[PDB]
Ligand binder design. Sequence first.
Ligand SMILES: C[C@@H]1CN(C(=O)[C@@](C)(O)C(F)(F)F)[C@@H](C)CN1C(=O)c1ccc(C#N)cc1
Ligand SMILES: C[C@@H]1CN(C(=O)[C@@](C)(O)C(F)(F)F)[C@@H](C)CN1C(=O)c1ccc(C#N)cc1
Lengths: 355, 355
Amino acid sequence: GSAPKYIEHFSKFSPSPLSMKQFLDFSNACEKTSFTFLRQELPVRLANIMKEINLLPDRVLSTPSVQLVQSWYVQSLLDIMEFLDKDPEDHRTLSQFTDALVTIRNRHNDVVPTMAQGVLEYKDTYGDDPVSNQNIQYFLDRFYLSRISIRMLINQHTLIFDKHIGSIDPNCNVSEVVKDAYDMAKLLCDKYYMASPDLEIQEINAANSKQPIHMVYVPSHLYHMLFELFKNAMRATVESHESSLILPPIKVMVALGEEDLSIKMSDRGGGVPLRKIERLFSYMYSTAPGYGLPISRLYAKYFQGDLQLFSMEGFGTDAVIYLKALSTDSVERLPVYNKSAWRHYQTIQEAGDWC
Amino acid sequence: GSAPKYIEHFSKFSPSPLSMKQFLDFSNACEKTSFTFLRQELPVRLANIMKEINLLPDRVLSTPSVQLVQSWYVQSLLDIMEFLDKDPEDHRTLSQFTDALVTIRNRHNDVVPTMAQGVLEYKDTYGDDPVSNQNIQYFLDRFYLSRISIRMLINQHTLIFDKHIGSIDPNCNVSEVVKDAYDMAKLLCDKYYMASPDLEIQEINAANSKQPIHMVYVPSHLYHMLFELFKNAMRATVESHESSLILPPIKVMVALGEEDLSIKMSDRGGGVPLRKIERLFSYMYSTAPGYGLPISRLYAKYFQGDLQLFSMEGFGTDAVIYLKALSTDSVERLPVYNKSAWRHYQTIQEAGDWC
Ligand SMILES: C[C@@H]1CN(C(=O)[C@@](C)(O)C(F)(F)F)[C@@H](C)CN1C(=O)c1ccc(C#N)cc1
Ligand SMILES: C[C@@H]1CN(C(=O)[C@@](C)(O)C(F)(F)F)[C@@H](C)CN1C(=O)c1ccc(C#N)cc1
């Protein structure tokens, strides 16, 4: 019965944002060195997000969803406390940990669908107004980024201690990951629509005209973003041309500049009105009766990147993923609990500044 | 010595956002009808913006710039009070007005450069930090939109009472306005660089495949936005290819959908890092030792549109202007003084929610 205490403790610490090069330095660059680090970091990260939840309307708190996941974190937090007084050296004290991590990871595997359920519960229970949308948007963005960062650490440890350093590829060939996400989307598009647009890729390596474009990144993260975009671009190109015979291709450009590595995906799927675009990244409005876009964007932001959309109604849409080109600039984007984060939930909107 | 009083009065009223079709209904759809309207509207709009200024740091208030323009509005407000007790019918009582408008318009002709001077005064006097940037951004956006809306009314009256209804073209051929802004930028580009990229235009009239794209809009407003973008796209295409012989063209696409009319301008001028883009629309950071972009965007927003940028470092930049396709949806976007607008100036930032 000391959960509130632990959370009060570790909640006082700020999480330590790691860079992608520090990740590259790490089989056996001492997991002892990691164990001791993860012993404090995970609890600090779990506690900060747990501390922020506890401070949202009891209307949201009392729902089975929020309390279900809120109880998952409480258990994961306790699940790792065990090792605070333990001593490494014991080749079994740190394997008790790797297992303790794999067990915590799977315990949270369905947090996204679970949390989406809460959004729906809220829409039908309290309505879908801007202030609700705003608070949910603010919180889910932080909650999910928090989750992404925790899973990153866990995957890095579990994978490294069972060319690639954990889930990191130091020579990630962006165009290859583009092709992979494409092939997968194509296969699904073919089954469901029995027709699919082709793919054209083009690279622009500013500094080195023909050297293939490589970067240090987490391929699975990039695959996720690209796959989500290919699906939308495919669904729209197919559906908007159901009476046309032509079927334009989806074009992708990978450009590498001094500090940015950009990927643009252009489709001619009809486009979307500016007003609806703004709603495409909102958890509340994109819920019924998925969260590919809002979450794909958190993956972009996690390492200081971004994901943006801009279409032309009546023509098509461009989706662009901005990633940092240098591993030096690829530092975790983490949400922290402060007096600053507190007042973002004090939105008392009623009659704006514009008419 | 009653300025504070008048401002306290009219400041209680909210400005009346007009649609572009109401503008189309109006030589002599009775300027009496307008005179009486503008008699209350202008004072209400002048007072609301004047009321918001009076409530910004005295550090900003005391500068010659802010007080210089603050005294211009005070005089324009009084300049129109005169007609509050007047009676139309008198064919000279309303010409005293048209002149009173032309005189007020010119009195404010240099408010932009004047206000930009204040920004610089502030940068050097108090520094250029995010909270300063934010408050200036918030206020200048509103101040300038307020100004744009006031000049719109004035121009509509003065022009209509000296095919087009004032400054409104009910059959504005977007592609023609594109060509015009281009020719002008080209001429300047040719003088200064003695080389300039060509232009390709393409239309996508979704509903009517080949009918030229026309819309009801204020051509001079659209010309302003396009000219500003062509200049930047030209400067960058030329400068980034000073050692290349090839010189790609600037491509523009005009797409007309059910509710949106979009114009995209794509250049291959090298592109800009994501981090600097965010700073391109900031009055503070774009000041030295112009305001084409931040202001061009207010012109887009004035009638519910927008202006966005997205480039690929090492390749080029896309700039897109979103306008409403229907005159029904083209309603003035006006800033209003409320308890809502008040708290946007209570930014006490110090240590954010992210680490
Ligand atoms: C041991 C820590 C964490 N780490 C790891 O690779 C992992 C696999 O253990 C994990 F992904 F799980 F984090 C490197 C960034 C090196 N590293 C550090 O450089 C470090 C960072 C901050 C502190 C502190 N305080 C101490 C060490
Ligand atoms: C007379 C007003 C203003 N107006 C004008 O065209 C102008 C030229 O006078 C100006 F641009 F300067 F505004 C139309 C939108 C018609 N109109 C209205 O439809 C109207 C709108 C609101 C109210 C009110 N309250 C009364 C009339």
